[PDB]
């Protein structure tokens, strides 16, 4: 196989797309034009990891013993208390939705970032031959659609709450009389707050996305360029350091989401 490193590093960027127009697999060499071409490879790991979350949670939640918690249960309600403490700190209101949303965000995104840690040609070398696939990029978060999917799934909630908890009234007030506070300056206030609000979610989506796209990118480069016998003396620092990146960048997702919503209402 004439795999030149310039082209090997190229193929990994490809996606297992489905040409829902033809209910077909979009081949890497020619990319069909349309908005109707699901990236199946990440999307599927989405549900897979949400399942490994929910089953290990329900398999205690529905089975919870308040005695000396099992050495296993301990970690689960540990994270539970961590999350609830953070939420109670940065949110004060009555809405039930905030805390479970934050928990799901936090752990789900942690896992989605985690799956980068396995050697990146492992599943792509297996799935090619055991299944007959052209490509498989493992990290669900390294595609924008899912990250912006969640950013907009929280923008939905932002709008819901910003209209509910302060009606049209305070919503329109802040959208008209801020920052400059004078009525002649309402033309100034409008656009500014417009894209101010519209940037906050997008910056969330891209903060999650870019970090992981360029996480994967470093692994592709090392895995392709350097000779077998030394890819470790770099992949080691990079991987153990990226541990911290995945942790922080998920925790930050949770914090900023909670802060956006709590700020909107209160």
């Amino acid at each position: 196989e004439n795999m030149t490193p310039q082209d090997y590093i190229g193929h990994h960027l490809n996606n297992l797309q489905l040409d829902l127009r033809t209910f077909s697999l979009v081949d890497p060499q020619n990319p069909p034009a349309t908005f109707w071409t699901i990236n199946i490879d990440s999307m599927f790991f989405s549900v897979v990891l949400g399942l490994l979350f929910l089953v290990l949670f329900r398999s205690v939640a529905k089975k919870a013993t308040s005695g000396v918690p099992g050495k296993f249960q301990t970690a689960i309600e540990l994270v539970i208390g961590f999350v609830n403490g953070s939420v109670k700190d940065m949110y004060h209101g009555k809405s039930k939705l905030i805390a479970p949303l934050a928990l799901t965000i936090f752990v789900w995104v942690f896992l989605m970032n985690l799956m980068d840690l396995l050697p990146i040609d492992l599943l792509p070398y297996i799935a090619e031959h055991v299944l007959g696939l052209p490509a498989l990029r493992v990290v669900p978060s390294a595609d924008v659609n899912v990250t912006l999917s969640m950013a907009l799934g929280v923008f939905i909630l932002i709008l819901f709450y910003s209209i509910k908890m302060k009606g049209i009234g305070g919503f329109t007030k802040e959208l008209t009389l801020q920052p400059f506070n004078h009525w002649a300056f309402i033309p100034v206030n409008l656009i500014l707050e417009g894209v101010s609000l519209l940037s906050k979610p997008v910056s969330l989506g891209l903060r999650l996305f870019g970090n992981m796209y360029a996480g994967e990118l470093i692994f592709i480069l090392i895995a392709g360029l350097l000779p077998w016998w030394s890819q470790w003396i770099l992949n080691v620092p990079w991987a153990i350091f990226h541990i911290l990146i995945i942790t922080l960048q998920a925790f930050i997702f949770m914090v900023l989401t909670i802060v956006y919503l709590s700020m909107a209402s209160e």
């Binding site: 960027l13 996606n15 797309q17 829902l20 990319p31 908005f35 109707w36 071409t37 699901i38 990236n39 990440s42 999307m43 989405s46 549900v47 949400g50 979350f53 929910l54 949670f57 329900r58 205690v60 939640a61 529905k62 919870a64 013993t65 308040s66 689960i76 309600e77 539970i80 208390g81 609830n84 039930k96 939705l97 805390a99 479970p100 949303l101 928990l103 799901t104 789900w108 595609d143 924008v144 659609n145 899912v146 912006l148 999917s149 969640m150 907009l152 799934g153 939905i156």
Partner: protein, 52 residues
């Protein structure tokens, strides 16, 4: 990369995962906590009233 209908396909699984965790995991695992805190309080109220 290129925006895709995936943006909408994933919004489904997201919003629904939130509910199938909220309605059946969160209040339960907070119940297992609060129901123990209610007990941790009683021993202390005991000790103090018993000193009194």
């Amino acid at each position: 990369m290129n925006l895709n209908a995936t943006i909408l396909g994933q919004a489904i699984a997201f919003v629904l995962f939130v509910l199938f965790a909220m309605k059946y995991v969160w209040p339960p695992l907070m119940a297992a906590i609060e129901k123990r805190q209610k007990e941790i309080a009683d021993g202390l109220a005991s000790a103090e009233r018993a000193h009194k």
